Design a protein that fits this description.
Oligomer: homodimer
Largest interface: A-B, 34 and 34 residues
CATH class of chain A: Alpha Beta
Strand content of chain A: 15-25%
Radius of gyration of chain A: 16 Å
Number of strands of chain A: 8
Bound molecules: 2-(2,4-dichloro-phenoxy)-N-(2-mercapto-ethyl)-acetamide
Helix content of chain A: 25-40%
Distance between the termini of chain A: 14 Å
Protein name (chain B): Caspase-7
Number of domains of chain A: 1
Keywords (chain B): Acetylation, Allosteric enzyme, Apoptosis, Cytoplasm, Hydrolase, Nucleus, Phosphoprotein, Protease, RNA-binding, Secreted, Thiol protease, Ubl conjugation, Zymogen
Organism (chain B): Homo sapiens
GO molecular function, one term (chain B): cysteine-type peptidase activity
Structural class of chain A: alpha/beta
Number of helices of chain A: 5
Strand order of the largest sheet of chain A: 2-1-3-6-7-8
EC number (chain B): 3.4.22.60
C-alpha cells in the first residue's frame, strides 16, 4: 500500500536525550528551558502512543550505549522507532555532557542489517541543536529514516512540534505535520528554519 | 497564510530549467553519461505536461551553469507559482560537475533566496539533482526550498520521478510524489542506495489549481 503498516501491539520506543548541563571542559552554557522542552515532548509523544523514556545530561558514550542497546532490542511488535535529541550542536555533531559525538554514529546501529526487526519500519530522529561557545556534515542514506533538524518557554521548534502533534498527530501524515512546524517557526522572524530530511518509502500516520 | 498549501493562482506555473551534462572535458577524468538524454527528454515532456515553461541546456561549462541561474534569478517571477531546476551531471559531495570542472551546488541555488530573489518569496523553489558519482556536504537552509538528491546510477530515479509525476502529478502533493519515488528506486534493490528529500517547504505543494 502507500502507508506504513501501523498494525502492531505498540507504536514503538521513543528515547529522549535531554542534555542541559555540560562539563566545564566544553565551555558550553546552561540550556535553560530544555526542561520545559523535554517535558512537552514526553507528554506529546507518550500521548501519540510511544514508550517514552527520558535521559538527562548524557555523556557521549551514554548516548551511544542508549542507542546501541535500543537497536539491539527486539522490535517485532513495534510499528516504528523514535529518538529525540536536545542539546548543543554544531555541524555533523551533537554535544554530550563530556564533549562532542557525531550524529550519524547514533543512527548507525539502526541500519538495514544491524536492526533486522526495525527493517521496513520508520526510524524517526528529531534533533534540536544549539550554537554557542561562551565545517561539513554527511547525512547517512538509508531507507525508512527521517530527520527533523533544527537550530535556534522552550524552543520555537519544540513548542510547535508538540502543539501540532497534540492536535493533528492522529489525522495528518508525518510530512504535513513537520511542514506546519516549519511554517510555524518561520513566522516568528538571522532568519532560520528547520528542515526535514526524508528517506521514507511510505506515508506515516500515527493511527490504525 | 491560513490555508496549508501554496497559492497556485498565477498566470503560469513557473520556469523549469534542465541542465543536461552528457559530455565532459577529458581533463576532469569523467566519462560520457550514457542515458542522460533519455532522462532530459522524459523530464522535459513530464514538466511541460505539468504546465512549466521548460528550457533544456546541454553540456554546460561551470560559468554557464552559474550565469544561467543568476540570470534566471534576476527575472521577474511575479506571475509564477514556483520555480523548478533540474541538474543532470556528475556530482560528488556539495559539488556538481560542469563540463570543464566542478562548482558547488550551493552557489547555484544561492541566487533564489528571499534576500536576492524577491519575486519568488513564499513560493516553492524546487531542485531535483541527479548527480552520478564516478565525503561531506553543506545544505543551504532557507524557507520554501526543496531538494531531491539521488545518487543511484535512463536513470532509475529520473524514470520513476517522471512516471509518478505524469500519473499523479495533479492530485498528489510533492512529498507524496517523491515518497513514492524513493520507494521504487528502493524496490529496484532486493538486489543499495535511495534518493533523499530535503524539505524547507512551509506549505503543501499541489501542482494543480
Ligand atoms: S536538513 C539540513 C540541515 N542539516 C544540518 O545542519 C546537519 O544535519 C544532519 C547531520 C547529520 C545527520 Cl546523521 C543528519 C542530519 Cl539532518
Ligand atoms: S539528502 C542527504 C544526501 N544528499 C547528498 O548527497 C548531498 O546533498 C546536498 C548537497 C548540496 C545541496 Cl545545495 C543540497 C543537497 Cl540535498
Amino acid at each position: 500500500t502507500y502507508q506504513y503498516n501501523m498494525n502492531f501491539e505498540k507504536l514503538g520506543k521513543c528515547i529522549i536525550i535531554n542534555n542541559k548541563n555540560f562539563d566545564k571542559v566544553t565551555g558550553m552554557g546552561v540550556r535553560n528551558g530544555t526542561d520545559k522542552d523535554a517535558e512537552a515532548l514526553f507528554k506529546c509523544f507518550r500521548s501519540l502512543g510511544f514508550d517514552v523514556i527520558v535521559y538527562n545530561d548524557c555523556s557521549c558514550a551514554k548516548m551511544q550505549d542508549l542507542l546501541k542497546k535500543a537497536s539491539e532490542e527486539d522490535h517485532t511488535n513495534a510499528a516504528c522507532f523514535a529518538c529525540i535529541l536536545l542539546s548543543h550542536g554544531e555541524e555533523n555533531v551533537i554535544y554530550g555532557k563530556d564533549g562532542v559525538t557525531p550524529i550519524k554514529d547514533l543512527t548507525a546501529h539502526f541500519r538495514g542489517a544491524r536492526c533486522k526487526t526495525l527493517l521496513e519500519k520508520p526510524k524517526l530522529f528529531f534533533i534540536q541543536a544549539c550554537r554557542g561557545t561562551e565545517p561539513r556534515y554527511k547525512i547517512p542514506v538509508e531507507a525508512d529514516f527521517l530527520f527533523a533538524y533544527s537550530t535556534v518557554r522552550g524552543s520555537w521548534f519544540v513548542q510547535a512540534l508538540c502543539s501540532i502533534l497534540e492536535e493533528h498527530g492522529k489525522d495528518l501524515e508525518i510530512m504535513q505535520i513537520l511542514t506546519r512546524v516549519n511554517d510555524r517557526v518561520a513566522r516568528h522572524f538571522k532568519k532560520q528554519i528547520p528542515c526535514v530530511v526524508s528517506m521514507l518509502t511510505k506515508e506515516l500516520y500515527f493511527s490504525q
